[PDB]
Amino acid sequence: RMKYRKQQRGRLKGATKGGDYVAFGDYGLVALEPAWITAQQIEAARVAMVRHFRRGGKIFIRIFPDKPYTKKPLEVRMGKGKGNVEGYVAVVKPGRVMFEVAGVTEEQAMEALRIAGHKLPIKTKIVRRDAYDEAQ
């Protein structure tokens, strides 16, 4: 994971929709019904992919290790300053533009994702480049 040299301790909780979509290579994994996702799990996929792909030609990225999740205590009784930092991860909720390359050229990439996310943690879908995009 990576949410290094943060700045604060913790966030809060909500969820509902955002701004992920594009393309960025044509080997895409897009979420759909999630929320936050373990930076770890994340790396999981990272691995899954990386390894499948004859183990070399790079994939890309997508979301980030974003926030700090806290179960606070360890199992006590509740009233801590709610302190304790512990699990860091992504906050993606409306089918998000999760972008992963390599040069698989195929349903091979497919598999890669297949497992990566099948795994990961939600109802989600995948594809390629479908309606470009024009900027300034």
Partner: protein
């Protein structure tokens, strides 16, 4: 020999008294000197005619004027008191 919870009171002793200030005197309404209008802990407000800025960035009625809302657009916010009637 006795498993019952465990101490844990890290502490966030934080506090800020309630406050006031702001856009506090309604359009046109009868506005007389001594009558305060809009207090600003800044300078969103330029004391235009008959508008007296107190030793505190406090918009106070300098004259018997009809509530003069003078947003001088971009110059900034300008407050004014209109010559009674």
């Amino acid at each position: 020999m006795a498993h019952k919870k465990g101490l844990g009171s890290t502490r966030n002793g934080r506090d800020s008294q309630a406050k006031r200030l702001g856009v506090k005197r309604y359009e046109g309404q009868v506005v007389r000197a001594g009558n305060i209008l809009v207090r600003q802990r800044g300078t969103r407000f330029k004391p235009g005619k008959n508008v007296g800025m107190g030793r505190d960035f406090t918009l106070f009625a300098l004259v018997d004027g009809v509530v003069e809302f003078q947003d001088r657009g971009r110059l900034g916010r300008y407050v004014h008191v209109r010559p009674l009637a």
